[PDB]
Write a protein that binds this ligand. Structure first.
Ligand SMILES: Nc1ncnc2c1ncn2[C@@H]1O[C@H](COP(=O)(O)OP(=O)(O)OP(=O)(O)O)[C@@H](O)[C@H]1O
Lengths: 307, 445, 270, 310, 461
DNA sequence: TTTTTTTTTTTTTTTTTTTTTTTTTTT
DNA sequence: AAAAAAAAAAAAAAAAAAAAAAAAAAA
């Protein structure tokens, strides 16, 4: 059923189109329900096809599935369980950064400050009681940012290398403005019987007879040309490759090409294996060499067919 | 007849290979481009291969774009008129009714890749667009089974690695994106399950806080009857009491240690209890909702995997059976062994005088070129490209197998009717066979 | 005494490492310390051709480079995990066992300049007609590149404590409580905007921003730790930083490991 | 600790952009001998500066094998001046009331040869180092020119020269030397570059002053400082035809001269401006206290007929 | 034994035993031209695999298979390859054979589990290396892609990088002195850079002399300290002298690691230069000696090749010729067959990425057909040259082989062709082969009576 | 004069040829 | 078990596209 595939592909395209708004929405808020509002629709569009299992729709489905798992990932990262004891929560460490970056400020402006496996049970009125009074400064110049710039340089693993002037002062200048008209304005584009194997067979079983016999002494020869006298040989090779001419040499010397006429029986249950094993009775081939000078020696046997 | 549009209408050539400026239109579903090879045959197919977002390294007719330029010029451009005018088309409201994509290559700087609309309005000049419009039309141009390469046929048949044919066939019929995306989504699910098992410990911490806060409520308002619930008969207030004051110091130390835990008062103890309780009873809801969502996702993924297994087996057997049914025209046959362990596409073919299973490199010519066609025509129903191109399928085989190639490919282009075709063979089949059934056209350079 | 004659022989039999230490020690002076392998090879292919020696296997001169950089002064070249001598990108980083317990000197003598460089709430550095005396007090670094760790320990300590996720607007409205303006006025010590500071901070790969697209609503972006802040830092030393910021001594800090880990989880990842 | 100590001290010195006073390294050594707990009681400052010199010799062996070097130069404004400027900023944060000999040696970290490897070790663009070279040629050209007038009593060169003159002679009844020549161009002329703009030169001079080589005098004029020794060590000056010291034959662009008619007359036989004999402040102090009172080139007397250089 | 016109090294008649479709069949060749022909997969293009395996050749030189015993007709046990080749008057130093016999027969009998079996030279037991050197001494090589190309390597010609084209087109005669000349060039190239490094060691010596100046300064500083130590006796002139020596001595002298810093590191740099330069000069002299003799004959050969090639190439429709290049210092001497197929396009190179199947096939034929006189090779095996060739580019590629094989002084052209065009132009000394098939053939596996009967060359036997 | 578009340059990342090296059939 | 070309493996080389910066022109 093609129509079902067409329409469910359209539905897949629509869901993939709205997927970007879905992803932005889950990125902002942190709500999982958008991962399921489309999961229901993709499960629907998946099961809606039951008669042909056409690839490509499964491919769109795979893209939709990795996208839904991605939205689930974005949502699952956005859970936050805050404790009252854990002394690393955000508004208890930003209000300690804003503690350390001003100890010299409190000593400079002389505005002094007073005191206001443990299993992590409870500690709130020592690390949120008086470490929160430092929360109303909002001007840059008050904090010594030269003390949490130099607590990342001797605590982290920064690479402290200096600037040397013996080298870069002796570089070369660059008056190498590129060539005008390297190559511009080309814009020149000027707005301006080959196979014929059955012919021999339709001559054979119309003129010779269904069990007649001729030879090289009669068939491949030609009294005027050599082309038409070797093309016949290649046509004979095609015919005997097709298994339609009987070529077993009698001891007189001449070859014998007779129309292999299997008495008409279309039953093949043993004729097929008979032919296959008769070819397995391997036809060690008769290399039927013909030259140019001896084309005139074997005309028939003594230079006479129809010169 | 209905033709889902996406069939390339016109190739417009500006300084390419050996053609300054010639443009010839394509046909309905099968076209014949003949003449003399190189003289306007593989150039057209190289234009169609490149101007659909492919490099020239994997074309074997020029290892650099800047080498493909007509010698005597500076910039080459090729205009490809797709057809966006029927079912399944791509944004008919913006791109008009006939997309026009072109690529401009010059002997220096970056090559130019542009989407142009119908009338001429330039849309987006990016290489990520042409790789999206045709991905929408689903035309795989890179791998040989869709766009065969005249110089790569003779080597693809035999010289390709055992894994080459397998991976090309697999990623060609879309059957590998499914495995990759499903395994990738499973990995995402594993990472999410690990984050959930991590969140389980934080939820345990919240649970411990909720229960110990309940314990604080109990140990706080356990001293209610001792000093407050006696308000019954003291209404006259608000001698012989021999045993009044007994444990005033013990109750004092108890109240001190109870209210001096961290510094909260009685109402503040109950307030923290309520806050931690609400935190726990909301985190529970969020955690369980996430768990249900993940479990439903996982079960849907399992129902994807089983259908994937079924689809793989079905597609492989379809390939096998159509391959054999095409081989049986020359009275020999074989079987394709998709060994999913060593990742192969070994083509075991036999002749009219054999016994045991022969090799894929043993037979040649007749048992080769006619295995090329037989393997390719078992990768045209699974892969559903809207267009297909053939360039000298008969790389070396005589006249009695070219007919049993042509009169088989014409037939296999009747069962499917969504794919346009262009065939590149230097021979003469113009008005030689009974190809008068419409859908074909002659184009000799 | 094996070290001195050892490094002498090392620099002796290998004259391409001697002409490579004085390259990676002068690409990463204090700017971006990453070196892509493609470049490390495109320079080693020319610093060994004109060196009268066949260039050895990369995994030989790599151990040679590490041996030199460790012996003379104390550095280390190291490849970062890109999602051993196979890392696609390498960074320098100090490696001597740090001496905080007497890096008191280097924190003090670079904190003291606050009592002399900003009085009455203005910076007196751009005052040209001033008596500059730094070369006689040995001021321990620059000052347009010391409030670049000043603002990079209050952006990668407000991503190290929100579970490796913080939005853009949340970060701006969480920085404006420090005084750092955001409407477009340059921060008045290091003389640059805040958005361009974040962009150049991206180019150094200290943080990575996530780009979205919504034509109807707009774009929102998040600031999760990049790679350089994961390799040139470490939990074994982030514990030290956060142990000092709170000023609490070694007794009330035993929990800090798991306290951080259950609030930071997907940051020290790949 | 050999690895440890010789690993710490180089970090100390190239962290500070290079240059670092000796009385800071000798305190970092007491920092690190306690960080590995290798305490000492039988020592004075002599053994300490000895051990510092020994460690610098070892580190210099390794570096000279690598291709960089730790020079050991003197700042020529004198013991009392530099100890004032340094231990005047060590009164709030101070170690344990130790006594230091008022020293002047300034270890510096520079590269010897301008190879192709360290060709690009800068933050500056092309135009910016072009301005740097243009500025320094202006510095030397303004240095060669001497002019008459009253010399200020504000700079430390002037107060120190007068103090040591009075201390050596003993008789304070002496007047001012009546000329000055400055190697420190004023701002308004360097602002007059052609290609770049004014604000560019403003912030560029600020950057350079932060890179510890363009110290700015108290009057608002900058010269060139202890990353001159990384720059054409002596042909930096003989290129613009400036000679060297007398007592040590190292460089000097600030101190005492005697440019009177006798030691005057740069070599016009060849045209190279080989100017007068120049001293360092400590060099001049020793040369006047324990040698003579006379310019050695053509027998002058400089305690009355000398020049101020600033 | 009508050996009346067979040139030495040739092959006279093949007879095969237990091959892929040849259980027992015997060819009967001709001295001049034996156009092998027949229907598809008729076992007519297997006689080429047979010559490549019966002249002790390798298996990869054909491309038909990959392993050595894959030609043993599956169903058999052992395969016998009997082939006869005319004896040469220049080939000697061979065991179990004299220099009188005018016909030698090399036969290799491949077994099942033993790929590298024994050989057969005139019914005598011969090892592998002996017959390999004998077939080499018969001036017949099979790796020369200009002489022996199989069906699976016809257009592996154009994929040959130029340098290798020169090597395999001049190893038709001899040029090993070109190899020793390349060795001389690389020796000179390394010597040049060593000399430049010595010229930098010169500046090292200059720096060492400057450091010696610093050493002398350190000795004068030590002399100041010598005075300081010799005169320290505080028990007024003496006191004044002590104060005039303290500040005089620079307290920053770093001669500790400079005094004995360098004494003998430069004499080892100055212990290699002069005779090394003389050796560079004698290398240049020998290089000029070797290069002087090469160029004249090596360009005269190429001029003859160009004349014959252009006279043969003008029939396709536009001009072209072969040009040598000697641009680089002899390690990249290379040849480029340059071709034009119509006039208005320029003269272009020959490679895969330039021309089609038909053009590259025409080039591969006309390059190895005009390289006829200028090499000693009795037989050549052109393999089914029809890949992408239309009528006009097949009649000519065949006519220009017939009129080369029947003019005079003809070498054996092995030509196989499944296709066959009507109205060709045949001549006298050619021998049109063929290969029959079909189960209606009187199988001569037991009776060798009718093993060849039908050939029109032995009309009465 | 300032903003936007063009343009050139640089950087990063893939792909074709090429070398390496343990394993391995072998005398 | 003492030589051998062999298979297979790692590891650098070039190619193409993208992004940033600078120049130039229009408003
Ligand atoms: N290893 C083998 N064992 C047995 N038979 C084989 C083997 N390999 C190939 N054959 C058979 O022998 C025949 C080989 O013939 P040949 O190699 O001449 O084919 P061809 O080269 O394609 O023919 P042409 O090139 O003349 O069209 C094939 O038809 C094939 O079926």
């Amino acid at each position: 059923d093609p129509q079902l595939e067409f329409k469910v592909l359209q539905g897949y395209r629509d869901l993939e189109s709205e997927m970007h708004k879905g992803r932005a929405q889950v990125t902002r808020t942190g709500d999982i329900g958008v991962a399921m509002d489309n999961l229901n629709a993709v499960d629907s569009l998946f099961n809606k096809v039951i008669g042909i299992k056409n690839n490509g729709l499964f491919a769109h489905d795979a893209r939709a599935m990795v996208s839904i798992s991605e939205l689930a990932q974005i949502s699952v990262r956005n859970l936050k369980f805050d404790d009252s004891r854990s002394m690393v929560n955000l508004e208890n460490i930003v209000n300690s950064l804003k503690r350390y970056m001003l100890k010299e400020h409190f000593k400079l402006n002389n505005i002094a400050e007073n005191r206001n496996a443990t299993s992590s049970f409870k500690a709130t009125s020592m690390r949120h009681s008086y470490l929160q009074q430092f929360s109303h400064y909002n001007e840059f110049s008050q904090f010594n940012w030269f003390r949490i710039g130099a607590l990342y340089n001797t605590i982290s693993k920064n690479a402290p290398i200096t600037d040397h002037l013996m080298g870069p002062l002796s570089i070369e200048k660059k008056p190498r403005v590129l060539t005008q008209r390297r190559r511009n304005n080309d814009q020149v584009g000027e707005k301006i019987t080959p196979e014929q194997v059955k012919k021999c067979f339709k001559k054979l079983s119309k003129k010779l007879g269904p069990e007649g016999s001729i030879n090289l002494f009669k068939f491949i020869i030609d009294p005027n040309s050599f082309s038409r006298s070797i093309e016949n040989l290649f046509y004979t090779s095609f015919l005997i490759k097709e298994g339609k001419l009987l070529m077993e040499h009698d001891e007189e010397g001449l070859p014998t090409i007779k129309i292999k006429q299997s008495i008409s029986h279309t039953d093949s249950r043993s004729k097929e294996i008979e032919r296959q094993r008769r070819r397995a009775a391997h036809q060690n081939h008769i290399i039927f060499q013909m030259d140019m000078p001896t084309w005139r020696k074997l005309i028939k046997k003594y230079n006479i067919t129809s010169p | 007849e209905e033709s889902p549009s996406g069939y390339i209408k016109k190739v417009i050539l500006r300084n390419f290979m050996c053609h300054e400026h010639f443009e010839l239109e394509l046909g309905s579903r099968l076209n014949f481009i003949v003449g003399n090879n190189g003289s306007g045959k593989s150039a057209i197919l190289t234009a169609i291969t490149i101007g659909l977002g492919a490099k020239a390294s994997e074309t074997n007719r020029g290892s650099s774009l800047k080498d493909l330029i007509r010698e005597g010029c500076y910039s080459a451009k090729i205009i490809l008129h797709l057809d966006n005018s029927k079912y399944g088309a791509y944004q008919q409201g913006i791109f008009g009714n006939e997309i026009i994509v072109e690529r401009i290559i010059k002997r220096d700087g970056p090559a130019s890749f542009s989407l142009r609309s119908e009338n001429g309005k330039e849309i987006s000049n990016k290489k990520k667009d042409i790789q999206t419009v045709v991905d929408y039309f689903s035309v795989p141009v890179s791998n040989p089974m869709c766009f065969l390469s005249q110089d790569a046929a003779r080597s693809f048949l035999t010289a390709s690695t055992s894994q080459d044919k397998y991976s090309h066939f697999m990623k060609g019929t879309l059957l590998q994106e499914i495995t990759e995306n499903l395994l990738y989504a499973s990995a995402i699910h594993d990472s999410a399950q690990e984050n959930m098992a991590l969140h389980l410990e934080n939820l345990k911490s919240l649970k411990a806080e909720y229960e110990d806060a309940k314990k604080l409520l109990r140990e706080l308002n356990q001293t209610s009857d001792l000093n407050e619930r006696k308000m019954l008969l003291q209404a006259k207030s608000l001698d012989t009491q021999e045993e009044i004051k007994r444990e005033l110091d013990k109750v004092s130390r108890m109240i001190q240690k109870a209210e001096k835990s961290l510094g909260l008062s009685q109402e503040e103890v109950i307030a923290l209890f309520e806050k931690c309780r609400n935190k726990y009873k909301e985190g529970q809801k969020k955690y369980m909702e996430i768990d249900e969502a993940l479990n439903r996702l996982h079960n849907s993924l399992k129902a994807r995997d089983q259908n994937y297994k079924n689809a793989e087996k079905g597609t492989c057997f379809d390939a096998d059976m159509d391959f054999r049914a095409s081989l049986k025209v020359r009275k020999f046959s074989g079987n394709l062994s998709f060994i999913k362990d060593t990742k192969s596409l070994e083509i075991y073919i036999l002749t009219t005088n054999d016994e045991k299973a022969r090799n894929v490199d043993t037979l040649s010519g007749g048992e080769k070129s006619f295995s090329q066609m037989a393997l390719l025509l078992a990768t045209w129903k699974p892969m559903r490209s809207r267009i297909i191109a053939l360039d000298q399928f008969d790389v070396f085989m005589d006249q009695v197998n070219r007919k049993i190639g042509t009169t088989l490919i014409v037939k296999k282009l009747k069962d499917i009717a969504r794919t346009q075709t262009i065939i590149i063979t230097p021979q003469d089949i113009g008005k030689i066979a009974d190809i008068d059934s419409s859908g074909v056209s002659i184009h000799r350079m | 005494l094996t070290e001195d004659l050892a490094v002498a022989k090392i620099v002796k039999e290998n004259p391409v490492a001697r002409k490579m230490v004085r390259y990676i020690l002068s690409r990463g002076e204090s700017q971006n310390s990453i070196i892509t392998r493609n470049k490390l090879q495109s320079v080693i292919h020319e610093a060994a051709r004109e060196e009268n020696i066949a260039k050895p296997s990369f995994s030989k001169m790599f151990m040679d480079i590490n041996a030199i950089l460790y012996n003379v002064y104390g550095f280390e070249l190291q490849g970062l995990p890109s999602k051993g001598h196979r890392a696609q990108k390498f960074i320098l980083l100090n490696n001597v066992p740090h001496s905080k317990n007497f890096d008191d000197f280097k924190i003090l003598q670079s904190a003291h300049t606050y009592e002399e460089l900003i009085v009455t709430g203005e910076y007196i550095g751009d005052d040209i007609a001033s008596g500059t005396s730094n070369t006689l007090e040995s001021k321990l670094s620059t000052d347009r590149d010391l409030v670049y760790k000043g603002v990079l320990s209050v952006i990668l300590c407000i991503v190290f404590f929100s579970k490796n996720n913080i939005l853009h607007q949340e970060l701006i409205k969480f920085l404006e409580t420090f005084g750092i303006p955001s409407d477009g006025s340059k921060i008045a010590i290091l003389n640059i905007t805040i958005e361009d500071l974040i962009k150049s901070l991206e180019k150094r790969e200290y943080i990575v921003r996530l780009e979205e697209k919504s034509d109807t609503d707009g774009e929102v972006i998040s600031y999760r730790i990049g790679r350089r802040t994961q390799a040139e830092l470490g939990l074994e030393s982030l514990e030290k930083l956060v142990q000092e910021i709170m000023g609490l001594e070694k007794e009330q800090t035993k929990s800090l490991h798991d306290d951080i880990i259950k609030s930071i989880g997907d940051s020290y990842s790949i | 600790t050999g690895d440890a100590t010789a690993k710490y001290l180089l970090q100390y010195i190239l962290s500070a952009r290079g240059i670092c006073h000796e009385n800071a390294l000798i305190l970092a050594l007491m920092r690190l001998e306690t960080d590995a707990s290798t305490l000492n009681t039988e020592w004075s400052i002599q053994q300490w500066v000895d051990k510092l010199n020994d460690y610098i010799n070892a580190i210099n062996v390794k570096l000279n094998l690598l291709g960089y070097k730790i020079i050991r130069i003197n700042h020529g404004i004198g013991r009392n001046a530099v100890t004032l400027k340094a231990k005047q900023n060590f009164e709030s944060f101070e170690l344990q009331s130790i006594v230091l000999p008022e020293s002047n040696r300034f270890f510096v970290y520079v590269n010897l040869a301008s190879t192709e490897e360290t060709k690009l070790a800068t933050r500056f663009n092309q135009n910016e180092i072009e301005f740097i070279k243009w500025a320094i040629e202006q510095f030397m050209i303004s240095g060669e020119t001497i002019v008459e007038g009253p010399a200020l009593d504000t700079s430390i060169i002037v107060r120190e020269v007068n103090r040591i003159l009075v201390a050596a002679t003993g008789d304070s009844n002496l007047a001012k030397w009546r000329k000055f020549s400055t190697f420190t161009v004023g701002s308004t002329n360097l602002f007059q570059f052609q290609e770049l703009t004014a604000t560019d030169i403003e912030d560029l001079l600020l950057r350079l002053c932060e890179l510890k080589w363009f110290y700015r005098t108290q009057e608002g004029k900058f010269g060139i400082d202890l990353r001159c020794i990384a720059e054409l060590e002596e042909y930096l000056t003989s290129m613009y035809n400036l000679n060297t010291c007398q007592n040590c034959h190292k460089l000097a662009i600030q101190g005492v001269r005697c440019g009177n008619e006798s030691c005057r007359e740069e070599n016009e036989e060849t045209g190279e401006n080989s100017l007068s004999q120049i001293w360092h402040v400590d060099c001049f102090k020793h040369y006047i206290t324990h040698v003579s009172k006379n310019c050695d080139r053509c027998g002058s007397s400089l305690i009355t007929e000398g020049v101020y250089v600033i | 034994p009508d050996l009346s016109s067979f040139q030495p090294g040739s092959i006279i008649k093949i007879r095969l035993q237990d091959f892929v479709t040849y259980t027992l069949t015997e060819f009967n060749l001709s001295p001049s031209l034996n156009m092998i022909i027949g229907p598809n997969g008729s076992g007519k293009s297997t006689f080429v695999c047979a010559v490549c395996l019966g002249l002790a050749g390798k298996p990869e030189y054909i491309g038909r298979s990959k392993k050595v015993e894959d030609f043993i007709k599956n169903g058999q046990d052992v395969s016998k390859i009997e082939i006869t080749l005319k004896n040469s008057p220049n080939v000697t130093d061979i065991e179990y054979i004299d220099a009188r016999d005018e016909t030698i027969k090399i036969t290799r009998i491949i077994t099942r589990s033993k790929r590298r079996s024994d050989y057969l030279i005139n019914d005598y037991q011969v090892s592998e290396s002996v017959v390999k050197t004998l077939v080499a001494q018969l001036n017949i090589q099979l790796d020369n892609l200009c002489q022996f190309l199989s069906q699976e390597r016809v257009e592996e010609f154009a994929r040959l990088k130029s340098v290798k084209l020169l090597v395999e087109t001049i190893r038709s005669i001899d040029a090993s002195l070109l190899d020793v000349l390349d060795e001389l060039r690389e020796l000179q190239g390394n010597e040049q850079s060593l000399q430049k490094d010595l010229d930098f060691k010169k500046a090292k010596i200059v720096h060492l002399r400057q450091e010696s100046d610093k050493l002398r300064k350190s000795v004068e500083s030590l002399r100041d300290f010598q005075n300081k130590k010799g005169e320290i006796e505080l028990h007024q002139d003496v006191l004044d002298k002590l104060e005039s020596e303290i500040a005089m001595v620079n307290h920053d002298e770093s001669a500790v690691t400079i005094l004995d810093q360098v004494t003998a590191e430069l004499r080892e740099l100055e212990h290699t230069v002069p005779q090394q330069s003389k050796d560079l000069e004698t290398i240049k002299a020998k290089l000029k000696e070797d290069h002087a003799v090469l160029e004249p004959k090596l360009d005269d050969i190429v001029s003859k090749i160009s004349a014959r090639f252009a006279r043969l190439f003008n029939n396709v429709g536009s001009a072209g010729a072969v040009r040598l290049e000697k641009p680089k210092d002899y390690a990249e001497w290379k040849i480029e067959i340059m071709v034009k197929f119509r006039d208005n396009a320029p003269l272009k190179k020959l490679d895969s990425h330039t021309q089609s199947g038909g053009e590259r096939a025409v080039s591969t034929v006309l390059y190895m057909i005009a390289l006829q006189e200028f090499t000693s090779a009795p037989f050549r095996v052109v393999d089914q040259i029809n890949q992408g060739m239309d009528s006009r580019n097949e009649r000519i590629v065949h006519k220009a082989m017939v009129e080369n094989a029947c003019a005079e002084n003809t070498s054996q052209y092995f030509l196989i062709t499944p296709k066959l065009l009507t109205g060709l132009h045949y001549h006298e000394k050619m021998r049109i082969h063929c290969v029959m098939a079909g189960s209606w053939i009187p199988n001569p596996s037991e009776d060798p009576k009718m093993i060849h009967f039908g050939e029109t060359s032995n009309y009465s036997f």
